[PDB]
Amino acid sequence: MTSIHFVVHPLPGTEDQLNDRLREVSEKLNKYHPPLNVLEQATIKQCVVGPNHAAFLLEDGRVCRIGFSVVSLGEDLQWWPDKDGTKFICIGALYSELLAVSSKGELYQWKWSESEPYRNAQNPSLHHPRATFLGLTNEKIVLLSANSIRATVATENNKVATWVDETLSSVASKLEHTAQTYSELQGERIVSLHCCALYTCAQLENSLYWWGVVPFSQRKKMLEKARAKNKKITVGTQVCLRNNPLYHAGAVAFSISAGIPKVGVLMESVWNMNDSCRFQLRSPESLKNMVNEEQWSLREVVFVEDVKNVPVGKVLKVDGAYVAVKFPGADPSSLLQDCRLLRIDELQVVKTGGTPKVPDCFQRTPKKLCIPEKTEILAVNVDSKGVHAVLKTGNWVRYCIFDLATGKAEQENNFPTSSIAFLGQNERNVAIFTAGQESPIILRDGNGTIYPMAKDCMGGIRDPDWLDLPPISSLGMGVHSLINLPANSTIKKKAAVIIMAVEKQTLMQHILRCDYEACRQYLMNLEQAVVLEQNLQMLQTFISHRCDGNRNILHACVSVCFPTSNKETKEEEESKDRKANAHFILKLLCDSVVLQPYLRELLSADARGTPFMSAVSGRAYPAAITILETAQKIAKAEISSSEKEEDVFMGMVCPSGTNPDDSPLYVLCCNDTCSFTWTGAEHINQD
């Protein structure tokens, strides 16, 4: 019954703007595609988005795809054809293909442009052109992590296999891996696998490690010693000039502009490590055969070959301060044109294999990823600047981000809300979703709801502003560029496209929009439902469901009773309607015959510290009185459990662990009006 929703975040952007992109989706449900109607009736195990499409996975094992643009989508639901009894268990997203995984551990390919996924006559069992390349044919995989240009699969043999998209196959066997059992993961079993456009992270029971390119600062610091070492002689000596550019014209490289991978070569020498150059961008037809100029920032650009063949020449004649060195390209005229005469002080002796080498950032065996202590790992994801995670030590949850080039949590944050509310009903529901390409991060909750995130002036998690959304089933997202974008405009180059599934809650939503008629009409039907059958399921899921911020049915019925306008409250001596049904629903809920027995555990709870306490703190005083009256009534008849009168009643007014500043009496006196409401813009003498 999950409703699928779309949202677009124009990158580059801030954490704030995402919330406004997650607010109108809540507004739309509180206000009021045809091809996707049949998709809602079945649960979606996983959802991914490619360059111009979006893939879906169903509970039984079927896979489907859809195309969209910027969102407007066509009406074509091309199911994956499975004539044989083939069921799928995992799905990945690639810029070129919709690679899939069947019930058995062999992986398929459904390249976006092509209609039929994969047919091979000579090898009918083969469904991936590299399936025999990584040697996964005789084993089975249970993990899969696919990103814009990357993919990694792992077998029960603790064997991990990596490869890139076919648009980057020109420099395969450097990024990619043939697939063998490491000495990293041999100790603990693999529990999950994550990948991004630059590197892949594997999480173990008490360990995390990664392998791949490590650009940026770690890549940056390679040259301070390397340039110093290079800058710091007889006939027949292999000597080279002490000065040496970082990259000569001819190094191959690749980069991502707006989600479009482009492999390039440079036609000039890299002198400074912060300049930008116009690279050579080759047509895709000639990419696999193994000049335009578009400016490329050297920071993002990664050079994907190793220059171990730096020109070193053999000395043929030493004449005073000058040395005749013939670097790679007896008549004196022919020799002089090729052989170069250089000063002895500018030349340093070179051994065999001692020539300078480009960054060895292509990591195969990692270190510097340490969990603080024996702490359980909730969820882990990978972004453009680190590996996000949410850890836990007893009753202390946190949001630490490991900088892969450092070995320690770069910064530490504590959730402003109570950690016990983050755990929720099911602990494992917590998840962190990142697209990867400097994209924003959204993290889920214990109840499956979205926990809004933003920073404050001191650098910490700002106190959340609840978006009022139901729990989310699937939260796949990805980045795709703006096609047909005129170069003369200021509109952004790329955007992040996020999928959603709000999973629907009948009465939870019927109170969020203060519609009295639906709320009551639901109740006797429930009242007639709980009778004439003596047992069913919807009775006990009444308490189970939870809105944003660990708020139950009673909390939401209070969140709509908050005063909003000072009008009629001046007392100098349809918002107005919407508040009226808010009290009407609240009165109905308390006196309902069927729910009655469950108000004992309903009037005790959210993410900060009880429905009655939220009323006095939210300035809903008539709502607090009605809740207080019901609390007395419930406690009076409770005595049958052989417990005192005061403890049952006190659980619905001020629980034992409530902090001193959250008392209903103290909060009642604290609530006032700010000085601005009687002063104005002028200055007065006040504390």
Non-local CB neighbours of 360 within 8 Å, separated by 6+ positions: 222, 306
Retrieve residue 112's tokens. Answer: 């976006």
State whether residue 338 is helix, strand or coil: helix
Q: Report whether 350 contacts 238 (CB < 8 A).
A: yes
> Could you give the CA distance from residue 232 to residue 242 in angstroms, rounded to a whole number?
7
Q: Report whether 420 contacts 395 (CB < 8 A).
A: yes
State whether residue 662 is helix, strand or coil: helix
SS3 of 527-593: the string is HHHHCCCCCCCCCCHHHHCCECCCECHHHHHHHCCCCCCCCCCCCCCCHHHHHHHHHHHHHHHHHCC
Helix (H) or strand (E) holding 340: strand 340-343
The structure was resolved to a resolution in Å of 3.0
Using the structure block, give the residue that is written with the tokens 């300035």: 619
> Could you give the CA distance from residue 92 to residue 101 in angstroms, rounded to a whole number?
8
Radius of gyration of the chain (CA): 32
Using the structure block, give the residue that is written with the tokens 């453009």: 384
> Could you give the CA distance from residue 107 to residue 98 in angstroms, rounded to a whole number?
10
Method: cryo-EM
Backbone phi, then psi, for 678, in 5-degree steps?
Answer: -130, -10
> Could you give the CA distance from residue 259 to residue 493 in angstroms, rounded to a whole number?
10
Using the structure block, give the residue that is written with the tokens 């096609």: 483
Q: How far is CA 43 from CA 4, 39, 70, 548, 550, in A?
A: 11, 8, 26, 21, 24
Retrieve residue 258's tokens. Answer: 């707006």
State whether residue 226 is helix, strand or coil: helix
Residue 393 has what DSSP assignment? S
674 is in an annotated binding site: yes
Conformation bin of residue 550: beta by default, left when phi > 0, alpha when psi is -120 to 50? left
SS3 of 252-283: the string is EEEEECCCCEEEEECCCCECCCCCEEEEEECC
Retrieve residue 278's tokens. Answer: 């116009």
> Could you give the CA distance from residue 48 to residue 217 in angstroms, rounded to a whole number?
31
| Maximum C-alpha span of the chain | 115
> Could you give the CA distance from residue 600 to residue 602 in angstroms, rounded to a whole number?
6
